Subunit: 331 residues, 3 copies
């Protein structure tokens, strides 16, 4: 492995993904990533509701990491001195020691380096899982995903290559914010102060917010993801704790690896797919019509009342053969 | 498209389906449908619980429309002056303008005509989706399904054609009825009056009723579906807002397009299948034994406490080889 | 049929499975099983919470029965005079009379014998279903699963035989235990006394406990399942009433018949699979690394707060190629 070429990769904040090649450029290499854990307060809605996030690289969700099958992913995880809690990381893509969790427990002021072989292709969830406080770290936003591309890039069930023009990473988070006796969300001066209260809400299994990329409207308006008619887009989606049912309003999932494993053939022409909590999935789509599209968790209450809605702004020419207003709304 | 043949279809109330041919007769055509939206109070159980439904063509679910791949569906949607709300329609089978929702917003007293090419084969959900009040209209019964059949009819995963003798459309609905101080269901003069309270229930993500065809027991008793031993039946099921897990008690789902897409090979020998909220699915089965069968959502609490149960009354001869009581209940 | 060989099989309590051959050793035979129903009080957590269980063979879940496709399963069901309720059994594997539910309704002091032909291969759920009290009996622990193996044993997508060295049956149960005004779980003298209170909790659709093998921690520590590096393990998992998303922390599901049906090709390299309420599924995995593994329901709140977590204790040598701590947690 010492003789294997190494390469440092720079991570970019979601929904964007760091530079990479779909088809493996050469042979197996050791790909290096460094992430710093940041315990920070984040405002998740327009009412000012705060959540003491625990974030990888400072964002919720943590960045998407990309390697190819059989490469080695080497991660330098750092838990700064300014943090108050112990943290670790669990890659569902790895094999052994609880996905690496048993080998990466670092307290504030510590760091560690873990190397694992990306033996299985597909998109996988990764997240913090500290013994005794596993769900809390996860629902505080401490999770992300990694994509392990096949050496020869993406393909459909029947062997045809699927090359994408754009890739977006949508991380869905369920938050459980405690309320005081008047229905007002509470605020705390430190992460640990919220624990006891958060656990009570978690047990009801009913989130107060379900958001994409850390906040209500995070990916809407001018933060909308963009594409153009004719462009091929791969949308990676993950949920480390609760189920979701993604749906592109106005579009479809031409090829969907709902389970997120590339060795399992993709479902085609999907209207709404399902991604169970603890997994990541991927949908490939070629836009045919311009305009705005809403990407949502299709439990519409979760999408429109809880916050799970994002936008796609597509430029191009309308196709009247596909759809047309024969008679505009008139009396 | 004007040179294409056109055909008007008269819709039938669920669980029945309007006459259609499985194999597309000739070439593409423009299939025309007309639906009138009706805001009406419906009683959903024996206790007299009422809901202010928003019903396509007056029923919950709305009727099933059947077209073939590459046909054009031309829908004339009418929102009567007697209605108090604006409505529209989003077809999951359509490409562009939020499934047609952006092009069909009509106020009471208005009408519009939309046309789209049915490009992908499968069963799809259609529902109302007015900006700012999407979940409210959907959970008020404003949803249904469309079936876009392959021009050569259905086929199993490996070519064998699958021809059904009967087709039933079971639309499943999650309702959120507000309760008063005594735990009794509230009643309002108009739909608008129910909004705030309904919204509070919706946010708990817990429905008060989960019904088939608009009411608890709507498809039991003499309204039970019928078949005969040897009959091939296709059961289309849809849930526009939340997940469901259909199961035929005493039977199986021989071929199940759980995602509802015909270009995706069906699963076979299914005991219980899953349909994510915002999608429709289809299960094909050939009856082997006579008697009553219960068709339910297999979270038995939703099925027997909340209302998600229907019956099948099948005639024919008992097959002792398949099953027999060796010793009837005795001392 | 009458000339068919008969065979009495002695059942063992889960997670263990009675003796069987993966490849059918002869032609069809009538496999005979006997189960006694026991209504008993069980403690489901470390806080002494009691539940009046209704258990097939005295366990929660009921034992796993293994037969081969086209064999006949003849079950003798006994409901002792000491019991207080009528019970029956519904096999999702059977065809007719509600899975046998309509032919096996026995009052305390009665027995019955049912025979059915196991026509479809896969793992299926079986549960009690007394008309008008279906959910209550099922959520009181009265369910299990049966495995109908293909005559030629298990196979992957392209006819490659998959032979397991070990098999474990994890039965997951959702309990709904009432609480008094003080938030303390309630205890009852007889099962029937708990009915009214239990049903009001069931309607919230939120379980108080979600356990594996009848109790929190039932398969952890000294009761952890065992395997070694190199062994191929088949894990059968069932949930008769509610969805679950199994995940082996530190491992994967190399082959997963998520739907539990062997005629439906398995998904591969799964990180987390989904089993809808009312079905059984099976995952095949070959251990590569030693140590402890946690097998959980991946909604981590249900796993670590509600009780749905088990362990695997694996012996063998560590593979540093797959994973290695490059720099142990340091300053
Ligand atoms: Cu952490
Ligand atoms: Cu995990
Ligand atoms: Cu509407
Ligand atoms: Cu929709
Ligand atoms: Cu029972
Ligand atoms: Cu059942």
């Amino acid at each position: 492995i010492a003789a294997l070429p190494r390469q440092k990769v720079e991570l970019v904040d979601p929904p964007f993904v760091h530079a990479h090649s779909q088809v493996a450029e050469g042979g197996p290499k050791v790909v290096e990533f460094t992430m710093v854990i940041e315990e920070k307060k984040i405002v998740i809605d327009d009412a000012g509701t705060e959540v003491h996030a625990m974030a990888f690289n400072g964002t919720v969700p943590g960045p998407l990491m990309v390697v190819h099958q059989d490469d080695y992913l080497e991660l330098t995880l750092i838990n700064p001195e300014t943090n108050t809690l112990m943290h670790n990381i669990d890659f569902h893509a790895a094999t052994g020691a609880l996905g690496g969790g048993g080998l990466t427990e670092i307290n504030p002021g510590e760091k560690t380096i873990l190397r694992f072989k990306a033996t299985k292709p597909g998109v996988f969830v990764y997240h913090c899982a500290p013994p005794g406080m596993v769900p809390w770290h996860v629902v505080s936003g401490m999770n992300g995903a990694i994509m392990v591309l096949p050496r020869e890039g993406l393909h459909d069930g029947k062997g045809k290559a699927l090359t994408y023009d754009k890739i977006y990473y949508v991380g869905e988070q369920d938050f459980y914010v405690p309320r005081d006796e008047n229905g007002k969300y509470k605020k705390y001066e430190a992460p640990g102060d919220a624990y006891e209260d958060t656990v009570k809400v978690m047990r009801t299994l009913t989130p107060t917010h379900v958001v994409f990329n850390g906040a209500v409207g995070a990916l809407t308006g001018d933060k909308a993801m963009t594409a153009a008619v004719g462009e091929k887009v791969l949308i990676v989606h993950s949920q480390a704790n609760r189920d979701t049912r993604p749906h592109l309003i106005g579009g479809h999932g031409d090829y969907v690896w709902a389970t997120g494993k590339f060795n399992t053939p993709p479902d085609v022409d999907q209207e709404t797919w399902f991604i169970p909590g603890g997994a990541a999935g991927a949908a490939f789509y070629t836009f045919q019509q311009p305009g705005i599209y809403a990407y949502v968790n299709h439990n519409l209450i979760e999408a429109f009342e809880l916050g799970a809605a994002a936008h796609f702004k597509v430029t191009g020419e309308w196709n009247d053969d596909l759809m047309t207003s024969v008679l505009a709304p008139s009396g």
